[PDB]
Structure formats: structure tokens, C-alpha cells
Amino acid sequence: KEEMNKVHNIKCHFDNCNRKIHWKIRYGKLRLVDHALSHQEEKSIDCQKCEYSCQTTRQMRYHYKKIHANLKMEGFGILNIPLQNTKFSDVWNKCFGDQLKTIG
DNA sequence: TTGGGCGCTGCT
DNA sequence: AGCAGCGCCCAA
Ligand SMILES: [Zn+2]
Ligand SMILES: [Zn+2]
């Protein structure tokens, strides 16, 4: 539980990003996945109610709040997102590849 | 207006 | 462990 709550700065190595995500194991990987998806041109997150699509689950959460105000957004975990493919594996590697021992 | 992401955590 | 969500400060 201690090692659960330790801050690990995860550095994004995408060209001229170099942002540091102040991550914790407790948070899970969603904010890291979303950050990598933001560096990719594809809009692989699809709304469950309308035609909208976007890059990140954070974008989709904003979409639901504004367009689907009375509806819960559901099914947008890393296990629901199409991640097991080469395009995403490549972008994840570019951003965080040297830090996968810490991420898992 | 959009929304990154900090910090949160109910739940499995 | 860590998923899969959320409130909200502030310019990512
Ligand atoms: Zn980055
Ligand atoms: Zn929609």
C-alpha cells in the first residue's frame, strides 16, 4: 500500500513532448494510455450513444458531460479500448518504452 | 470551450 | 494491484 502510493514521474519521450506524468500504481494506466493516444492521429474512442469519436477517454468524458449530460459513460477502460495492435504498441513504446518495468 | 491531468477512490 | 471511473484547477 506504501509502494502503491509512491509518486513515479513517467516521462513522455515523444518528439518535443518531454512532459512528466506524476503517476502512482494505484491510478492504473489509463492516464498513460490516454497520453500516448493523444500523440496518435487516430480517433479510436467511439461514443456509445452518437457518432462522435475522439483520441482519449478524457475527451470522451468531456463529450458525455456536454452532449449526454444525464448519461453515464461506461466501457472506456484500457481493457475496452483497442490497444492490442501495432500502431498503439509503437506509440506507447515511443512515449514510455524505457519505463515499462515501472508501469507494468 | 476544450480538455490535460492532478488527485481522488469504489470496486473487482 | 490496479481497473475505470470523477471533480475541478487552470492552460496541460
Ligand atoms: Zn507526450
Ligand atoms: Zn456521443
Sequence spans of domains, chain A: 8-103
The CA A50 to ligand 2 mean position distance, Å, reads: 4
CA→C1' distance for A59 and B3 (Å):
6
Strand B and A53 CB separated by under 7 Å: no
The CA A70 to ligand 1 mean position distance, Å, reads: 32
Strand C and A23 CB separated by under 7 Å: no
Q: Are A88 and A82 in contact (CB under 8 A)?
A: yes
**Among the CATH numbers 3.90.75, 3.30.160, 3.90.1070, 3.90.320, which is that of A8-103?**
3.30.160
A12 is in an annotated binding site: yes
User: Any idea which nucleotide's C1' is nearest the CA of A22?
Assistant: B6
